[PDB]
JSON list of C-alpha atoms and ligand atoms in Angstrom, two decimals:
[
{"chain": "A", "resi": 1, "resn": "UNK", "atom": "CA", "xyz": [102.62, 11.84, 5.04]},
{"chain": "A", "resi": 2, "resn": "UNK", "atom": "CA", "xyz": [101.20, 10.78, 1.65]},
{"chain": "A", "resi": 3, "resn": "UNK", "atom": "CA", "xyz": [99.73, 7.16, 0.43]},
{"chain": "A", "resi": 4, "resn": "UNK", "atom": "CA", "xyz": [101.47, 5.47, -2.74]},
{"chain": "A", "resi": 5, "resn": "UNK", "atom": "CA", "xyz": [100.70, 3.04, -4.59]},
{"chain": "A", "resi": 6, "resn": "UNK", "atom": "CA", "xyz": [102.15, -0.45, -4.79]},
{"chain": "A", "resi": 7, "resn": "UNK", "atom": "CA", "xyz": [101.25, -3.53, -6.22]},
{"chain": "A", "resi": 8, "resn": "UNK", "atom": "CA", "xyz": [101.87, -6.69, -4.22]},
{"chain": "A", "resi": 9, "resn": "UNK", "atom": "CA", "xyz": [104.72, -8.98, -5.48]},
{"chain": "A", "resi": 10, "resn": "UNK", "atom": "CA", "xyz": [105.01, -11.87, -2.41]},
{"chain": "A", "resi": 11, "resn": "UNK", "atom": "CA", "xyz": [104.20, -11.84, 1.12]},
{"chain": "A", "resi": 12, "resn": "UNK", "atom": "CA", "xyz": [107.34, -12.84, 3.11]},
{"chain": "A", "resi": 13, "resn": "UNK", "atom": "CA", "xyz": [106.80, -12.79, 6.95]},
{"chain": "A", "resi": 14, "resn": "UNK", "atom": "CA", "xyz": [104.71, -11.16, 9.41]},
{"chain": "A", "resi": 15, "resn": "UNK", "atom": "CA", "xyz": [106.38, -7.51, 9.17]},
{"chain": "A", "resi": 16, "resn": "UNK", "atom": "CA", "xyz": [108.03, -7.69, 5.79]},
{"chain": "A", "resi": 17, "resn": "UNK", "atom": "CA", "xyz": [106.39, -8.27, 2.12]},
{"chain": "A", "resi": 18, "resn": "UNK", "atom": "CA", "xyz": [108.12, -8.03, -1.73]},
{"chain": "A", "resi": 19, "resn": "UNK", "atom": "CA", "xyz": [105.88, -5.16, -3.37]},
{"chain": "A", "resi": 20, "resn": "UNK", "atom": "CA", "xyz": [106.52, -3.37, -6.50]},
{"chain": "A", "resi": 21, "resn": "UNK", "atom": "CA", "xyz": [107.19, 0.29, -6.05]},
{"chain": "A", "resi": 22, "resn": "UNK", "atom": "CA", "xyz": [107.80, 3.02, -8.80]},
{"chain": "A", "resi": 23, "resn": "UNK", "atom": "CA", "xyz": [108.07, -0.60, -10.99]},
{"chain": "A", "resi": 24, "resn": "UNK", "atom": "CA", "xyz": [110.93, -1.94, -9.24]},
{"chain": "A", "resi": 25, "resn": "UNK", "atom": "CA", "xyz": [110.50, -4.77, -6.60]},
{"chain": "A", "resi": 26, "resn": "UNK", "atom": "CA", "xyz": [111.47, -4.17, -2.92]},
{"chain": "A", "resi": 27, "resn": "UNK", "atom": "CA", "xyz": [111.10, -5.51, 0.21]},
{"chain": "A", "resi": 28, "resn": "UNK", "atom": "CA", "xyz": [109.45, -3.63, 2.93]},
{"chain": "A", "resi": 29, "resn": "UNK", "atom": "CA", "xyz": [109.92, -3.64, 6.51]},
{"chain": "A", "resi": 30, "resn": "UNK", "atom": "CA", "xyz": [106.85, -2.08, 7.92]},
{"chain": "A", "resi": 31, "resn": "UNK", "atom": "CA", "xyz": [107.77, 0.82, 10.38]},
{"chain": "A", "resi": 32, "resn": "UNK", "atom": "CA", "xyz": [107.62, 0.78, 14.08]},
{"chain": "A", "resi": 33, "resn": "UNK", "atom": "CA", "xyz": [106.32, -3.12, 14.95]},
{"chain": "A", "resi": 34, "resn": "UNK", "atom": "CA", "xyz": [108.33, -6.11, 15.27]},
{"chain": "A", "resi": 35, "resn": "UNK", "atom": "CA", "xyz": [106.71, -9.29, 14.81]},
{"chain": "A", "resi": 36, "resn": "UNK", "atom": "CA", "xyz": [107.99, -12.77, 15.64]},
{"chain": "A", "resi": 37, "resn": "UNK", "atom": "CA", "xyz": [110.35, -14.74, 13.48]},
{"chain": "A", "resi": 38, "resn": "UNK", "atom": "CA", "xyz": [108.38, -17.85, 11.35]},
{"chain": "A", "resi": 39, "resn": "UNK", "atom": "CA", "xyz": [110.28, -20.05, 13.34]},
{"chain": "A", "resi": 40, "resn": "UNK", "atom": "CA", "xyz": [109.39, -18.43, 16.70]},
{"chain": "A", "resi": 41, "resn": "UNK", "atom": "CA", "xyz": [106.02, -18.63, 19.12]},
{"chain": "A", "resi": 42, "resn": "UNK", "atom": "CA", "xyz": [103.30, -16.23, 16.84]},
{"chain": "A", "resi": 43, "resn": "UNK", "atom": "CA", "xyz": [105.75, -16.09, 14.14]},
{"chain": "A", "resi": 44, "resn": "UNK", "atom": "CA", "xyz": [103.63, -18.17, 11.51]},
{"chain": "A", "resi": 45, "resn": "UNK", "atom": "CA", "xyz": [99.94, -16.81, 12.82]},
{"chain": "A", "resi": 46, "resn": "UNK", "atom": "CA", "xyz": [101.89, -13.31, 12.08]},
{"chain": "A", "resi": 47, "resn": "UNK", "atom": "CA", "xyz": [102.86, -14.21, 8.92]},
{"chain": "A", "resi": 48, "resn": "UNK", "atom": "CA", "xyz": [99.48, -15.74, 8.23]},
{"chain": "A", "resi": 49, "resn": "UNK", "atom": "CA", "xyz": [97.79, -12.42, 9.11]},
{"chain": "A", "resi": 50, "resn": "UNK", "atom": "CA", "xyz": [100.26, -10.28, 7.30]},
{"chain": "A", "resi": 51, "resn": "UNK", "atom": "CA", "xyz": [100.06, -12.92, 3.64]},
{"chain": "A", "resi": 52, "resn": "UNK", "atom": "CA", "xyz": [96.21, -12.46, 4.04]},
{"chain": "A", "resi": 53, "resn": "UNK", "atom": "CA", "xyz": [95.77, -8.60, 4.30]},
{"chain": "A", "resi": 54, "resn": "UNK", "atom": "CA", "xyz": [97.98, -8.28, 1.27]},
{"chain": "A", "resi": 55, "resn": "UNK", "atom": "CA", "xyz": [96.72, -10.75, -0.66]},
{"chain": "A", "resi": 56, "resn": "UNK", "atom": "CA", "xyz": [93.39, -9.95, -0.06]},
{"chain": "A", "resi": 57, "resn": "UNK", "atom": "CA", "xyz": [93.66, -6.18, -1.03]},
{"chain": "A", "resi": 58, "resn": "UNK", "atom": "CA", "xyz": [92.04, -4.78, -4.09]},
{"chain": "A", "resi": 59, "resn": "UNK", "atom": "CA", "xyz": [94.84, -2.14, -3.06]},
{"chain": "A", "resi": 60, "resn": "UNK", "atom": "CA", "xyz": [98.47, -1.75, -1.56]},
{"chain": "A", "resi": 61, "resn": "UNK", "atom": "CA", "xyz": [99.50, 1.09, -0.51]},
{"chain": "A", "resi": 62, "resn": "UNK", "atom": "CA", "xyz": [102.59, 2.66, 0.88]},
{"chain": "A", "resi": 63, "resn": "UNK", "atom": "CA", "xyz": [103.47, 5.52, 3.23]},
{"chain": "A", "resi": 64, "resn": "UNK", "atom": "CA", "xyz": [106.92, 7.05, 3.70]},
{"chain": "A", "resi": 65, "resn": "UNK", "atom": "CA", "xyz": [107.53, 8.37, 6.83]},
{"chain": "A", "resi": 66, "resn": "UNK", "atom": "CA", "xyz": [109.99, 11.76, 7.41]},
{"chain": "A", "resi": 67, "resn": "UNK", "atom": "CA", "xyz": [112.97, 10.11, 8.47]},
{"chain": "A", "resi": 68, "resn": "UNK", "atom": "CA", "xyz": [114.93, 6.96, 6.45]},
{"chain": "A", "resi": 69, "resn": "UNK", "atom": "CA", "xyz": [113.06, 5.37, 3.37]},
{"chain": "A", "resi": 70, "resn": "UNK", "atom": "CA", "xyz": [115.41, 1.73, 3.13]},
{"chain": "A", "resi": 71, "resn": "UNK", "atom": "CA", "xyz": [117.18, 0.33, 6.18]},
{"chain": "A", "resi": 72, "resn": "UNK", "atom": "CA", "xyz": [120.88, -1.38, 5.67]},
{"chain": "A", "resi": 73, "resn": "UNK", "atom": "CA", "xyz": [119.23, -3.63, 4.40]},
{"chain": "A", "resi": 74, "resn": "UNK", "atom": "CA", "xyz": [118.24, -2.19, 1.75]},
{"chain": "A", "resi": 75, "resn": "UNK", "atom": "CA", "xyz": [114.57, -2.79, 2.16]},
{"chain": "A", "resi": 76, "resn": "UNK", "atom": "CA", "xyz": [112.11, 0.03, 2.29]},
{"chain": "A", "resi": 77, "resn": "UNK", "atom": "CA", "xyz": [110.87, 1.04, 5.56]},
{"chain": "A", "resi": 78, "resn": "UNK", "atom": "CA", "xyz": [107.19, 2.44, 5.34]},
{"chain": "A", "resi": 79, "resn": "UNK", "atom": "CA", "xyz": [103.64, 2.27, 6.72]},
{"chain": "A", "resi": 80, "resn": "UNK", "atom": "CA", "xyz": [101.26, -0.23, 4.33]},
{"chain": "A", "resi": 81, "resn": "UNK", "atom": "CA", "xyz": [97.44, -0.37, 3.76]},
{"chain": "A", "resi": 82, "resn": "UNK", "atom": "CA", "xyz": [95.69, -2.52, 2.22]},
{"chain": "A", "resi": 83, "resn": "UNK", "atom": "CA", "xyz": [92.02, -1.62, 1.06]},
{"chain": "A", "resi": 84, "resn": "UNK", "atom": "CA", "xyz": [92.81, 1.62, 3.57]},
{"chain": "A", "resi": 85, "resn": "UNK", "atom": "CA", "xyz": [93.67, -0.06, 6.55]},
{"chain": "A", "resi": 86, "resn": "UNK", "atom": "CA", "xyz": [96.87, -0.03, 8.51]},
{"chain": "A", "resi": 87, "resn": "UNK", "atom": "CA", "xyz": [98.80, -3.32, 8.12]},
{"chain": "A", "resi": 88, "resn": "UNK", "atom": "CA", "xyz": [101.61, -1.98, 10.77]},
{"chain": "A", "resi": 89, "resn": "UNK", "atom": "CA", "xyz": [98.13, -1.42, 12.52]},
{"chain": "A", "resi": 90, "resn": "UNK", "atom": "CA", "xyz": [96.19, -4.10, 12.17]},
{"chain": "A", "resi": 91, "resn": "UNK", "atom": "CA", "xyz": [99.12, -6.34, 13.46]},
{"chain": "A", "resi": 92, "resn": "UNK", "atom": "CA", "xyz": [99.78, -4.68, 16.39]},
{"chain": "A", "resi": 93, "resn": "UNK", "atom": "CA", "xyz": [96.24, -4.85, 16.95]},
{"chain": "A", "resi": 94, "resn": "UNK", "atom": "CA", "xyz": [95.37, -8.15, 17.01]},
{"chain": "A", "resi": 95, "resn": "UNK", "atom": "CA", "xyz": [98.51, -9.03, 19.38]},
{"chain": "A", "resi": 96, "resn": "UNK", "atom": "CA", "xyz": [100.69, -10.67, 16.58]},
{"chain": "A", "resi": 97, "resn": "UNK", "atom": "CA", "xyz": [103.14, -7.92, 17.10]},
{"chain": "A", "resi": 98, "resn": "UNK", "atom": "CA", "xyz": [104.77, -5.32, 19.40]},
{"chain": "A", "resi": 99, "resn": "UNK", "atom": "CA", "xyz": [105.43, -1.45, 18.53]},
{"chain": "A", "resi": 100, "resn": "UNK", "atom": "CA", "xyz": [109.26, -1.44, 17.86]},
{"chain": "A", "resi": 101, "resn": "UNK", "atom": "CA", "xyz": [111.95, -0.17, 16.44]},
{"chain": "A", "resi": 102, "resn": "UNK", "atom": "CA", "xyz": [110.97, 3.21, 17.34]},
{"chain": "A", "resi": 103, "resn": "UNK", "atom": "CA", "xyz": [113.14, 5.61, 15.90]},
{"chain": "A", "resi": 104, "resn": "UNK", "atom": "CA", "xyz": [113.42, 9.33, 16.12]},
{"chain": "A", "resi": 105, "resn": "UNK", "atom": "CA", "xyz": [112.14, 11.29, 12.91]},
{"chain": "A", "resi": 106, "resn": "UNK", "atom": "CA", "xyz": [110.31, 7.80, 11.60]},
{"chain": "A", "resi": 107, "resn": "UNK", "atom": "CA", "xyz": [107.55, 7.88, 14.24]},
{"chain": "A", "resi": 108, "resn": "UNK", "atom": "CA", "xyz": [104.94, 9.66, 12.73]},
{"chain": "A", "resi": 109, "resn": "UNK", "atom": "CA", "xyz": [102.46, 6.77, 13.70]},
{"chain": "A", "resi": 110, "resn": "UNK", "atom": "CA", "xyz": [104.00, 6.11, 17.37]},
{"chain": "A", "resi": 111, "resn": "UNK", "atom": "CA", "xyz": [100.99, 6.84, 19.14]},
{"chain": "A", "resi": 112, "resn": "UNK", "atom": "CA", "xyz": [98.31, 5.07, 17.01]},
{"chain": "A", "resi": 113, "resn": "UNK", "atom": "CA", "xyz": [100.43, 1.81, 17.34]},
{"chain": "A", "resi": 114, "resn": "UNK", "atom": "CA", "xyz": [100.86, 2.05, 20.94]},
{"chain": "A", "resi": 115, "resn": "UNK", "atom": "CA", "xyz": [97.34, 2.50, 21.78]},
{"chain": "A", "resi": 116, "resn": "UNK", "atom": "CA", "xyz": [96.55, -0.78, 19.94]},
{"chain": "A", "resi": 117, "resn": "UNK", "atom": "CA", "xyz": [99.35, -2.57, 21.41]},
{"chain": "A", "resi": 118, "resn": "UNK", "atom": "CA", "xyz": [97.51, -1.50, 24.41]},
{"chain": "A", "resi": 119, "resn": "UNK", "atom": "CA", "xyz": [94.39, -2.63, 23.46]},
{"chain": "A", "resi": 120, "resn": "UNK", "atom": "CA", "xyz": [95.59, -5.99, 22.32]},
{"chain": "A", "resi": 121, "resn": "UNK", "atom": "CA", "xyz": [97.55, -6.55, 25.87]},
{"chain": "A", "resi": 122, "resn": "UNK", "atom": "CA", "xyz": [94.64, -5.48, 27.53]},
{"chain": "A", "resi": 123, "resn": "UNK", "atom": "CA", "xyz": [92.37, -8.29, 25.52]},
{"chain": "A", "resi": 124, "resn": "UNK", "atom": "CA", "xyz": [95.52, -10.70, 26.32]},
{"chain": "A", "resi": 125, "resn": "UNK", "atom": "CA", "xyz": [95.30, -11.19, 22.61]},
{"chain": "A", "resi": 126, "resn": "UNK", "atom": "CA", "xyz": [98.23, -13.96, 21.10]},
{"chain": "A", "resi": 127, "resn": "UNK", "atom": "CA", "xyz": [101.77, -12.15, 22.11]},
{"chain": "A", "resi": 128, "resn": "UNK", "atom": "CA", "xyz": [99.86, -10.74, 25.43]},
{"chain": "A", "resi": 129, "resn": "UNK", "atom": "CA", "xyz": [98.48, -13.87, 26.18]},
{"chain": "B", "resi": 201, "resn": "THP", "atom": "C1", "xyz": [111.98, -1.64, 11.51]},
{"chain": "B", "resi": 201, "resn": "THP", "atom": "C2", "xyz": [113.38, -1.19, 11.30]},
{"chain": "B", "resi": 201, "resn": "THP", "atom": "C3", "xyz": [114.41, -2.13, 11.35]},
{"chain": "B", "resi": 201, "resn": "THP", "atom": "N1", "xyz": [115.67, -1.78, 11.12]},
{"chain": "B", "resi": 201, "resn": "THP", "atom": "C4", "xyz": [116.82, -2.68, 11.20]},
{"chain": "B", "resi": 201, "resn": "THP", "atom": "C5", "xyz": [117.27, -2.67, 12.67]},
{"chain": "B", "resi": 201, "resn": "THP", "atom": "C6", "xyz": [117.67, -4.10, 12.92]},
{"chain": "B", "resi": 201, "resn": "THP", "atom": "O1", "xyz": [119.10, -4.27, 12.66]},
{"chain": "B", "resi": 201, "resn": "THP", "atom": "P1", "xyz": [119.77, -5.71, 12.97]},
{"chain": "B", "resi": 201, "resn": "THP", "atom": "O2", "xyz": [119.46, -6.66, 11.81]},
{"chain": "B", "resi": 201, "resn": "THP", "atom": "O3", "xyz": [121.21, -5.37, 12.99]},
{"chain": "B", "resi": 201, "resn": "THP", "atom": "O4", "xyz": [119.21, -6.25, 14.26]},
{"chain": "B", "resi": 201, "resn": "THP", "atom": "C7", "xyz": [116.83, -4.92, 11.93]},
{"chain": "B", "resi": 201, "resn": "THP", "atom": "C8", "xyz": [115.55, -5.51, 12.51]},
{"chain": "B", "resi": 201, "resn": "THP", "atom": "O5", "xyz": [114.80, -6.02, 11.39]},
{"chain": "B", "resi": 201, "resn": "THP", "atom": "P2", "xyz": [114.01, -7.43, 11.50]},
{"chain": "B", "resi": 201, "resn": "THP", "atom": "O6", "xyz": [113.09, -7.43, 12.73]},
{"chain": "B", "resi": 201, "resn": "THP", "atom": "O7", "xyz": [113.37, -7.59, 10.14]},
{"chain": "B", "resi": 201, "resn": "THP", "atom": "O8", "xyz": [115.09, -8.45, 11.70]},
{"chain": "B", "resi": 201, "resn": "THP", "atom": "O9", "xyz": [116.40, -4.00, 10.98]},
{"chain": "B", "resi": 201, "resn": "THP", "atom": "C9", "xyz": [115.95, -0.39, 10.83]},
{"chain": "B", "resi": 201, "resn": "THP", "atom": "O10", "xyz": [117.16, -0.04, 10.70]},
{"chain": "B", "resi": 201, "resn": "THP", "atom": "N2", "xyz": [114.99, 0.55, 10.80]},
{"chain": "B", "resi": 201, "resn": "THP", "atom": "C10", "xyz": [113.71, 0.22, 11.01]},
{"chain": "B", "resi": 201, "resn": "THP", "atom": "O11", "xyz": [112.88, 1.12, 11.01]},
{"chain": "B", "resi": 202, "resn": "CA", "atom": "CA1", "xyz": [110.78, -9.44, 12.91]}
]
């Protein structure tokens, strides 16, 4: 897997954000976590966390897994740092969301995610609280 770059156009919610890519705007869905809706328990602290990694970065980047690169949605479905860390990560991390959406082919990262989720539940952070 390689790193692009992207420049940040809006955060949205906890697991999806408006970047510019190639100089075209796009939604991403970040690959393999699901966080809650806004309007659902966690759903704003997510999208709190999410808006402030982004926003924060000096630098966005993207990372394409092997499998599909936009959902039928037509968003882009991809890993994201920001200043070289994990968002899909950091999220999962801190409790705010769970590994999801776990599909064959896109899963490069599987195993990282779940041993935070496990962490996280283990602290009883947020979600596992
Ligand atoms: C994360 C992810 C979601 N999706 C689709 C599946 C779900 O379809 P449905 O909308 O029919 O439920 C939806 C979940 O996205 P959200 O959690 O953003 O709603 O996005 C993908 O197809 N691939 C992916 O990798
Ligand atoms: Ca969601």
């Amino acid at each position: 897997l390689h790193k692009e770059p992207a420049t940040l156009i809006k955060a949205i919610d906890g697991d999806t954000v408006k970047l510019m890519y190639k100089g075209q705007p796009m939604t991403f869905r970040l690959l393999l976590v699901d966080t809650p809706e806004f309007n659902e328990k966690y759903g704003p602290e997510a999208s709190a966390f999410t808006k402030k990694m982004v926003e924060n970065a000096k630098k966005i980047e993207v990372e394409f897994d092997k499998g599909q690169r936009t959902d039928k949605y037509g968003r882009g479905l991809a890993y994201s740092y920001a200043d070289g860390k994990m968002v899909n990560e950091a999220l999962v991390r801190q409790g705010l969301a769970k590994v999801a959406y776990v599909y064959k082919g896109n899963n490069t990262h599987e195993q990282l995610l779940r041993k935070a989720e496990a962490q996280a539940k283990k602290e009883k952070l947020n979600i596992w609280s």
